[PDB]
Amino acid sequence: FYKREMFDPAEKYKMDHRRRGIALIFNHERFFWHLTLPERRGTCADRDNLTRRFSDLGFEVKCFNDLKAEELLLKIHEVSTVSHADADCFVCVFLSHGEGNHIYAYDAKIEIQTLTGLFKGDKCHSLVGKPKIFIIQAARGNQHDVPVIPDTNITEVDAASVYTLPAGADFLMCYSVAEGYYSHRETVNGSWYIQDLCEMLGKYGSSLEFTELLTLVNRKVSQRRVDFCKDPSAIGKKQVPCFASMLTKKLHFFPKS
Amino acid sequence: MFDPAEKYKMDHRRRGIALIFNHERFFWHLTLPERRGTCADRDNLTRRFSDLGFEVKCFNDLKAEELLLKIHEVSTVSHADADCFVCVFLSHGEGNHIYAYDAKIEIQTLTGLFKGDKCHSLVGKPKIFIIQAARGNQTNITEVDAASVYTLPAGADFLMCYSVAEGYYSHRETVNGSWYIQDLCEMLGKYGSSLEFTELLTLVNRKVSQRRVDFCKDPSAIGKKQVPCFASMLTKKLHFFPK
Ligand SMILES: Cc1ncc2cc(N)c(=O)n(C)c2n1
């Protein structure tokens, strides 16, 4: 008895390599004054929450805080050019503000496609046919601060701004919010999306197919309301996340043997 | 209590409506090439969706005004006794637009009609758009079109399914139909009544992405790979078990 090469409706990505793989986290809390972007209080909670959840899933987690665009590009290029032959997959998280096709580093915008492009095909051969998962918590920073240089739990509400695009074969692009909706971040507890993502990872990450888990996150986040007492006008500003999948098989994070 | 395996309730009187807008020819002023093979797609889709219990309504080569009128009429009837709604576009496209016979239409205008406040009877129900649309170029022949349509999501409980993502190429056989539609329909026929729908779509991703582009009859087409994608804002598991 063996499996002939017949089309299998339940085929899974092989997750039995020596290592789960690397999870990069790019955490941005502050920005160069010329960008006129507001601070992102609560993002450190997001970063720490994600670090614990992904590490429990077997990932080697590397966090970088407030990198300049050049440092960011350099660092992610370094990861893309080493061998991932002994890894199951790759995860990259961006926690920042964004606009259109761009995510902000500390000092400048970076095009998402340039970031994901580094892991396409034979640019990164050892990840070909392996899941490449980008998680993006990035929206429009409320620009009611000045173009000059400069502990209550507040919920900040940001309009969706980042195009929720896919990235190539075996890429999964996960977005905190879709166009027409609003992203929420609590200044102490962190972002709604990341909080809910992390809760689901801890509870179900080790058995549930990952896109099914993401769907749970869609439901959880979309069901959140702000206590209407708090101002100003977050009433009716619903958040619905989304994911764009070009995965070709089922993705599980069963505990590694 | 929060249920990790919660399914959309698919036990209504009717599965729901599946609209298909099929575009084979375009007004001369648009200077767009014909889409031979698209009628095979239409028939294939009609069969698979009707087998799933859908009430299928097909429309060929509608002008933009007629198309808008039809989709608005559908958005304004009651879906209270329906499980869900499906809308398929077979045409050329560009950016946020799909072409009708005589003009472009914004996808957001199309999907917006079925959003909560516009179509109260579809609230909390799956709204699935399937889009076979790419850039029209300037015996079974394979036509190859560059991806052109932005692969965007559409709101709560919408699922947006695209034949091709940016940087890849969409293929259509003049007799057999589009690669994407063929593979989707094959999966619908084999697994549509049991498999969770996004899981089925993932199979389609695999099938289409595995079609070889090494040895084309047209040497122009070599290396022009096709990978589809889907953008999900579904909030529950979607099945089409027999009603
Ligand atoms: C890749 C890309 N370039 C430009 C745009 C411009 C847009 N308006 C858009 O919605 N999307 C998704 C885009 N996506």
Would you list the DSSP string of B94-145?
EBTEEE-SSSEEEHHHHHHTTSTTT-GGGTTS-EEEEEEEEPPP----EEEE
Helix ranges (H only) for B129-212 are: 179-191, 197-209
Cα–Cα distance, A209 to A227 (Å, whole number): 32
Cα–Cα distance, B174 to B177 (Å, whole number): 6
What phi, psi does A201 have (nearest 5°)? -60, -50
Across the interface, whether the CB atoms of B156 and A222 are under 8 A apart is answered: yes
Q: At what angle do helices A192-204 and A43-56 cross, to 10 degrees?
A: 20
Looking at residue B217, what DSSP letter applies? S
Question: What is the third-level CATH fold of A1-257?
Answer: Rossmann fold (3.40.50)
B166/A contact by beta carbon, under 8 A: yes
Cα–Cα distance, A184 to A187 (Å, whole number): 10
Cα–Cα distance, B33 to A54 (Å, whole number): 49
In whole angstroms, how far apart are CA A24 and each of A13, A75, A104? 21, 10, 16
Strands B127-134 and B158-162: parallel
Q: Indicate the helix (H) or strand (E) that contains B154.
A: none
Cβ pair A25, A62 in contact under 8 A: yes
- Is CATH 3.40.50.1460 correct for B1-243? yes
Task: Say how many Å lie between the CA of residue A222 and the centre of ligand 1.
Answer: 24
Cβ pair A19, A58 in contact under 8 A: yes
Angle formed at CA B166 by CA A192 and CA B61, multiple of 5 degrees: 105
Q: Indicate the helix (H) or strand (E) that contains B17.
A: strand B14-22
Cβ pair B211, B226 in contact under 8 A: yes
Cβ pair B98, B149 in contact under 8 A: yes
Nearest to A129 by CA among A216, A256, A11: A11
A218/B contact by beta carbon, under 8 A: yes
Residue with tokens 């089925």: B200
CB neighbours (10 Å) of residue A152?
5
A154/B contact by beta carbon, under 8 A: no
Across the interface, whether the CB atoms of B165 and A166 are under 8 A apart is answered: yes
Residue A106's identity, in one-letter code, is Y
Residue with tokens 């919660």: B6
C-beta of A204 in contact with ligand 1 (< 6 A) = no
Residues of A in contact with B206 (CB under 8 A): 11, 248-249
Rg (CA), chain A: 18
List all residues 6 or more positions away from B221 whose beta carbon is below 8 Å from its beta carbon. Answer: B142, B144, B169, B213
CB neighbours (10 Å) of residue A12?
12
Q: Which of B123, B198, B200 to mutate to test the interface with A (most CBs of A within 10 A)?
A: B198
Burial class (CB in 10 A: 0-12, 13-18, 19+), A135: buried
Across the interface, whether the CB atoms of A245 and B198 are under 8 A apart is answered: yes
Cα–Cα distance, A61 to A48 (Å, whole number): 10
Q: Residue B157, by phi and psi: left (phi above 0), alpha (psi -120 to 50) or beta?
A: left
Task: Say how many Å lie between the CA of residue A188 and the centre of ligand 1.
Answer: 33
A236/B contact by beta carbon, under 8 A: no
Residue nearest to atom 4 of ligand 1 (CA): A101
Q: The tokens of A63 are what?
A: 């966090």
Across the interface, whether the CB atoms of A168 and B195 are under 8 A apart is answered: no
3-state secondary structure of B21: strand
Cβ pair B71, B19 in contact under 8 A: yes
Rg (CA), chain B: 17
Strands B104-106 and B97-99: antiparallel
Burial class (CB in 10 A: 0-12, 13-18, 19+), B73: exposed
Nearest to A191 by CA among A220, A215, A213, A166: A220
Q: Using omega within 30 degrees of 0 as the cis cutoff, is the peptide bond preceding A166 cis?
A: no
Across the interface, whether the CB atoms of A248 and B202 are under 8 A apart is answered: yes
List all residues 6 or more positions away from A80 whose beta carbon is below 8 Å from its beta carbon. Answer: A118, A119, A123, A124
Looking at residue B174, what DSSP letter applies? T
Looking at residue B223, what DSSP letter applies? T
Burial class (CB in 10 A: 0-12, 13-18, 19+), A82: exposed
3-state secondary structure of B55: strand
C-beta of A165 in contact with ligand 1 (< 6 A) = yes
Cβ pair B227, B164 in contact under 8 A: yes
Residue with tokens 């692009």: A173
Burial class (CB in 10 A: 0-12, 13-18, 19+), A248: buried
Burial class (CB in 10 A: 0-12, 13-18, 19+), A246: buried
Cα–Cα distance, B40 to B45 (Å, whole number): 9
Cα–Cα distance, A198 to B125 (Å, whole number): 26
A34/B contact by beta carbon, under 8 A: no
Q: The tokens of B22 are what?
A: 């099929």
A240/B contact by beta carbon, under 8 A: yes
Cβ pair B88, B18 in contact under 8 A: yes
Q: Indicate the helix (H) or strand (E) that contains B49.
A: helix B38-51
Cα–Cα distance, B48 to B45 (Å, whole number): 5
Cα–Cα distance, B42 to B32 (Å, whole number): 20
CB neighbours (10 Å) of residue B213?
15
Q: The tokens of A87 are what?
A: 């890894």
Cα–Cα distance, B103 to A160 (Å, whole number): 29
In whole angstroms, how far apart are CA B231 and each of B120, B158, B166? 22, 9, 13
Per-residue three-class SS string for chain A: CCCCCCCCCCCECCCCCCECCEEEEEECCCCCHHHCCCCCCCHHHHHHHHHHHHHHCCCEEEEEECCCHHHHHHHHHHHHHCCCCCECCEEEEEEEEEEECEEECCCCEEEHHHHHHCCCHHHHHHHCCCCEEEEEEEECCCCCCCCCCCCCCCEEEEECCECCCCCCCCEEEEECCCCCCEEEEECCCEEHHHHHHHHHHHHHCCCCCHHHHHHHHHHHHHCCCCCCCCCCCCCCCCCCCEEEECCCCECCCCCCC
Q: Residue A186, by phi and psi: left (phi above 0), alpha (psi -120 to 50) or beta?
A: beta
Across the interface, whether the CB atoms of A249 and B206 are under 8 A apart is answered: yes
Cα–Cα distance, B238 to B243 (Å, whole number): 14
Cα–Cα distance, A11 to B197 (Å, whole number): 15
Nearest to A76 by CA among A116, A106, A47, A36: A116
Cα–Cα distance, A155 to A41 (Å, whole number): 10
Angle formed at CA A14 by CA A10 and CA A17, multiple of 5 degrees: 165
B152/A contact by beta carbon, under 8 A: yes
Index of the ligand 1 atom closest to the CA of residue B150 = 12
Beta bridge partners of A103: A98, A110
Residue with tokens 């648009």: B30
Strands B14-22 and B55-60: parallel
Nearest to B37 by CA among B26, B51, B22: B22
Residue nearest to atom 3 of ligand 1 (CA): A101
In B, minimum Cα distance to A210 occurs at B199
Cβ pair B89, B131 in contact under 8 A: yes
Cα–Cα distance, B35 to B171 (Å, whole number): 11
Using CB atoms, which residue from B156, B198, B225 is nearest to A211?
A: B198
